[PDB]
Write a protein that binds this ligand. Structure first.
Ligand SMILES: *C(=O)[C@@H](NC(=O)Cc1ccccc1)[C@@H]1N[C@@H](C(=O)O)C(C)(C)S1
Ligand SMILES: [Cl-]
Ligand SMILES: [Cl-]
Length: 418
């Protein structure tokens, strides 16, 4: 039986079969014609699609080829058939978006998740660096394989499913929670002097620090300037109960119906912060938050659905599933409108991607890990609400920011997905 195909949303192949003339024990391509598993996108979708391998003795313990990793293994039952050819599985992936999202990294460690925010379609799930899935499935030498395993940037890992601290992009949720709680007034002008702030001397040598000097600061200025002090103060103003009440309406601790293994997102290590510092850190995306890029794109989907959360989906014919009224419609549109300044204001961090013919909201972020720094970029299509991007660059202190590489992807999406 011929193994079933994995195709993208347009029917283009992602995991298919192709006949080669191999130079009987086939080694490499030239003598005998054999059918081999082929991946047209190669490393661009290696971690997602995975690769196949020969059935081993340990596999036959839980009663041809079998999917070893990725969707080849998760869908191995439906794909392998029975010798009835295997079934064809059509994904939400867009091959053009998948290849563009992978090209921007250029061996930099990071990930990119592009979604249809109103339907949950995962248009692209990219992890960098990557590996050749055709060689892993049909013949890789110990030299090339050891180069993958000794790569400290870990190309085999699926970074879009790994949990990270979200960074300053998380301020969009903290601000929306503050709006619905009634403690955050969008027009209130907060006096903030200097670059560091603590509640009082009980914080010791720790301060919430910002990068830009500005006063007074309202909600929109705090988002565009990415002011940590404003959001640390607003988080302490609302309190842990009001803060967690809004956070708990998101998908924290919730396993998703995605064929991708993923630890659920968490707010902190325990049910209580037991620290004003930890409560304030969580307000601007640090602390003990662990959210994967797929989970981040899911949480941030509320700003393009009038406060409704749209769950992600990878299989095209799967019905859209939502979580209603995670935040209010007024809070979602207030935050999304304020994020237009990140792209449209000449001093905004995403002004490099400014397009006078397209409405793009955005929010950047740099997380400090116990150190190293990761860069994040969230963009929101506000012209038609047809795409959402969650882009991350690991070790941004050496690899640069996500904003510095993501413009060709955003330009591609504004002309294609629109
Ligand atoms: C949000 O993530 C904020 N980041 C920090 O407070 C930590 C940090 C890391 C490196 C340098 C300075 C501060 C602010 N948002 C990011 C961002 O948008 O890239 C800033 C670096 C502007 S700070
Ligand atoms: Cl799915
Ligand atoms: Cl920003």
């Amino acid at each position: 039986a011929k193994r079933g195909e994995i195709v993208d949303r347009n029917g283009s192949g992602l995991a298919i079969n192709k006949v080669f003339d191999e130079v009987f024990v086939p080694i490499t391509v030239a003598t005998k014609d054999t059918e081999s598993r082929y991946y047209p996108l190669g490393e661009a979708a290696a971690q997602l699609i995975g690769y196949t391998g020969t059935i081993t003795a340990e596999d036959i313990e839980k009663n041809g080829v079998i999917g070893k990793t990725g969707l080849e293994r998760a869908f191995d039952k439906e794909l392998r058939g029975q010798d009835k050819d295997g079934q064809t599985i059509k994904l939400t992936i867009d091959s053009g978006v998948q290849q563009q999202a992978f090209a921007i990294f250029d061996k930099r460690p990071g990930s990119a998740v592009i979604t249809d925010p109103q339907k949950g379609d995962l248009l692209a799930t990219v992890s960098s660096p990557s590996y050749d899935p055709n060689k892993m499935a049909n013949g890789i030498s110990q030299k090339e394989y050891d180069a993958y395993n000794n790569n400290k940037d870990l190309p085999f890992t699926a970074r879009f499913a790994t949990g990270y601290a979200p960074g300053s992009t998380f301020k969009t949720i903290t601000g929306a929670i503050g709006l619905d709680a009634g403690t955050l007034k969008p027009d209130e002008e907060l006096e903030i002097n200097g670059l560091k702030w603590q509640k009082d001397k009980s914080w010791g040598g720790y301060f919430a620090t910002r990068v830009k000097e500005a006063s007074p600061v309202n909600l929109r200025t705090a988002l565009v300037n990415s002011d940590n002090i404003y959001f640390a103060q607003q988080t302490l103003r609302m309190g842990e109960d009001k803060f967690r009440a809004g956070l708990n309406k998101f998908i924290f601790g919730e396993e998703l119906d995605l064929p991708i293994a993923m630890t659920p997102a968490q707010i902190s290590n325990e049910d209580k912060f037991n620290s004003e510092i930890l409560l304030a850190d969580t307000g601007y995306g640090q602390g003990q938050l662990l959210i994967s890029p797929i989970q981040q794109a899911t949480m941030y989907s509320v700003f393009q659905n009038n406060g409704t959360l749209v769950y992600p989906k990878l299989v095209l014919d799967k019905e859209t599933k939502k979580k209603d009224n995670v935040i209010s419609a007024n809070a979602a549109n207030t935050i999304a409108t304020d994020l237009l300044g990140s792209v449209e204001d000449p001093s905004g961090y995403v002004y490099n991607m400014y397009n006078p013919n397209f409405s793009l909201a955005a929010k950047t972020g740099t997380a400090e890990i116990k150190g190293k720094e990761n860069s994040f970029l969230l963009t929101l299509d506000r012209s038609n609400n047809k795409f959402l991007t969650m882009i991350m660059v690991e070790n941004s202190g050496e690899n640069g920011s996500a904003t510095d590489i993501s413009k060709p992807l955003i330009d591609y999406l504004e002309a294609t997905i629109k």
